[PDB]
């Protein structure tokens, strides 16, 4: 016996991965059989469950989330010049899936990102485009949406999203509101 492979802690729900102790914890954070937590930003909701329980949870506990149908929308964040840590959240539905669109203002910079209510593998089929439009000015960010399984905190932390500041916001804002064009496509 030269060494031992240990089963993923999520084997009980179907995971078949068995690995050395040194690369076990790494897998378990990434593992698809890990429970899903609440995709809403912040910690005021500590819910957890199955992927197909996520939308029901949002529909019961977070009824105030604005939702639009379509692959092309305008996400109009109102009151952008508010001081401090502020969030704007909405749902976009298209291609039979639901996407969470998030704009975060940190106490100052703005971070805008899109996440899929779905698995990491599902997220790979999609591209999103965020674009800010002004008079003969356009800033565009394009990327693969994150799965809510992974979340957006790490991405935001490494600026792996649309990142702009309050000065840039002024070039694109109208009446203290910023219209962000969001397009989702299958690639």
């Amino acid at each position: 016996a030269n060494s031992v492979l240990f089963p993923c802690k999520y084997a009980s729900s179907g995971c078949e991965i068995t690995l050395p102790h040194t690369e076990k914890a790494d897998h378990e954070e990434l593992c698809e059989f890990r429970p899903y937590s609440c995709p809403c930003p912040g910690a005021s909701c500590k819910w957890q469950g199955s992927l197909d329980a996520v939308m029901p949870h949002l529909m019961h506990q977070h009824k105030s989330i604005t939702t639009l149908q379509g692959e092309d929308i305008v996400f109009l964040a109102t009151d952008i010049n508010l001081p401090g840590a502020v969030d704007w959240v909405m749902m976009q539905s298209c291609f039979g899936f639901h996407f969470m669109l998030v704009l975060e203002k940190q106490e100052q910079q703005f971070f805008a990102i899109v996440q899929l209510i779905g698995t990491r593998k599902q997220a790979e089929n999609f591209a999103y485009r965020l674009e800010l439009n002004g008079h003969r000015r356009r800033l565009t960010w394009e990327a693969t949406p994150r799965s809510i399984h992974e979340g957006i905190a790490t991405a935001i932390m490494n600026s792996d999203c649309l990142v702009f500041d309050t000065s840039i916001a002024q070039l694109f804002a109208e009446n203290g509101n910023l219209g962000i064009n969001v397009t989702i496509s299958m690639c």
Binding site: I73, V74, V86, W88
Partner: peptide, 13 residues
């Protein structure tokens, strides 16, 4: 592109 517009109100943490 046909774009519905959603007015989203801010949330403070």
């Amino acid at each position: 592109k046909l774009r519905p517009v959603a007015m989203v109100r801010p949330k403070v943490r």
